Paper text:
The EcPBP3ΔTM and EcTPd* proteins were crystallized after pre-incubation with the experimental β-lactam [name]. It did, however, impart a notable improvement in useable resolution, along with slight changes in lattice constants. Since there were only negligible differences between the two models (RMS distance: 0.37 Å for 336 equivalent Cα positions), we will focus on the binding of [name] to EcTPd* because (i) electron density was clearly more informative in this structure, and (ii) despite differences in crystallization conditions, the complex has been crystallized in the same space group as the apo form, minimizing spurious differences caused by non-conserved lattice contacts. The compound adopts a U-shaped overall conformation, and its presence correlates with several conformational changes in the protein environment, mostly regarding the β2b-β2c-β2d, β3-β4, and β5-α11 regions, which contribute to the upper lobe, the bottom, and the lower lobe, respectively, of the binding cleft. The largest differences between apo and complex structures can be observed in the β5-α11 region, in particular residues K539-A544.
[name] consists of three major domains: the N-terminal transmembrane helix anchors the protein in the cell membrane, while the C-terminal transpeptidase domain (TPd) is the catalytic module of [name] and mediates cross-linking of PG chains by ω-peptide linkages between d-Ala and meso-diaminopimelic acid (m-DAP) residues on opposing peptide chains. The catalytic serine acting as a nucleophile in the transpeptidation mechanism is also able to react with β-lactam antibiotics because of their structural similarity with the d-Ala-d-Ala motif; the resulting covalent intermediate, however, has a very long half-life (with turn-over constant k3 ~ 10−4 M−1s−1 or less), effectively leading to irreversible inactivation. AiCuris previously reported on the development of a novel monobactam ([name]), which shows remarkable inhibitory activity against PBPs of Gram-negative bacteria, and good antibacterial activity, even against clinical isolates harboring several β-lactamase classes.
Residue numbers in the entry: 70 to 91, 164 to 203, 229 to 569
Amino acid sequence: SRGMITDRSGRPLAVSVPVGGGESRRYYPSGEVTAHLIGFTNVDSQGIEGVEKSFDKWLTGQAHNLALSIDERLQALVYRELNNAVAFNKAESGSAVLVDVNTGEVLAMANSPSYNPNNLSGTPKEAMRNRTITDVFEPGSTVKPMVVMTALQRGVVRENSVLNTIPYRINGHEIKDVARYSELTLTGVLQKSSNVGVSKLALAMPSSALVDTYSRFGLGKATNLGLVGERSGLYPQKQRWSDIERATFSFGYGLMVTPLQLARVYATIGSYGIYRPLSITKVDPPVPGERVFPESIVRTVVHMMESVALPGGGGVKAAIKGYRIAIKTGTAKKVGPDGRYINKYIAYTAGVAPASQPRFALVVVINDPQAGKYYGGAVSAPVFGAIMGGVLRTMNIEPDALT
Ligand SMILES: *C(=O)[C@@H](NC(=O)/C(=N\O[C@@H](COc1ccc(C(=N)N[C@@H]2CCCNC2)cc1)C(=O)O)c1csc(N)n1)C(C)(C)NOS(=O)(=O)O
């Protein structure tokens, strides 16, 4: 008397198989591939984790079946690249979230390491944490597209403007890029991911500017998926800011976001400024959402984000044959247990695709890579192109770019 969980097209993800005659159990056909989102039961058909626990009442007849928003073909290829990229880079964990730009539907949600819900004996209480909703890390350079949007909105800068990116000092702390550049343009600021460029913008604006924009894209706001351990991130509510706090805010200092939240930011970028709620159940279109940023400004920055994936950007590794993509890379220094920064990194690559008319938002988070490279452009960017390349071609998206 236990309902069945399926993906958005009917594929079984949690079935009650009869074993032993009359008595039945619970089988998970995808296994580790979708473990964290799906969860598991006990011997009493009681949900303990994931969708199995969140919908335990609906799945017993207080019995109905539940069509998730996941596409198992997409979940499988997300997991295949994410799992083998955690291993290859010898990382602590890795998370990836794939969201439908037009409906906020979660088409995939994966972590490595994982566990097998068909035989969870020996697996501790960790490794059952859904990293996509429980990990909170500083977003780093991935917020920079929103800084350009705010600057264009507040009239501080115009599309064709050359910024002075020579290093400088704010109070005691100094600001410098990975590679020194005497000057840069807006498209160049995001291309090279210039910490100096965006910090100059953050100082020519009231501190409330970036606070308003980041929130309009969902940061610090709950995701309301209903799952266990779903964290809302740490968000600054400061009444007064320092000059160094405003500057480092433009490249991901002073806030912590879950991978699910960061995927919602890029679904709002790919919708050109429409903010839609996230869903792990198959939705009935339409999903109108709320307009949170002017369309013309987000399209302008979406186009700027293409040069990250083109020769010169810090994300050329993510390129895909025959498609335009608009992405942003990111590297964050991890915070230690004492509250100060250690020598461990979070490698990001977030983006939308295809750039001509984005249909999918994708986020790749690789926690603590230790194998030769540590920054997103070399660690998570090639994973982005592998996943998104598989996504665009599985979903039969018309090729975009002459390549
Ligand atoms: C954006 O996230 C931003 N970085 C930060 O603001 C934060 N930390 O920065 C770390 C330093 O990161 C890098 C160092 C070196 C390289 C690199 N070798 N790049 C080469 C360029 C030419 C082609 N080959 C590769 C890349 C990154 C640090 O902690 O020291 C940060 C923000 S919040 C927080 N806790 N940390 C930059 C530096 C722009 N990373 O962007 S990127 O796209 O990964 O390159």
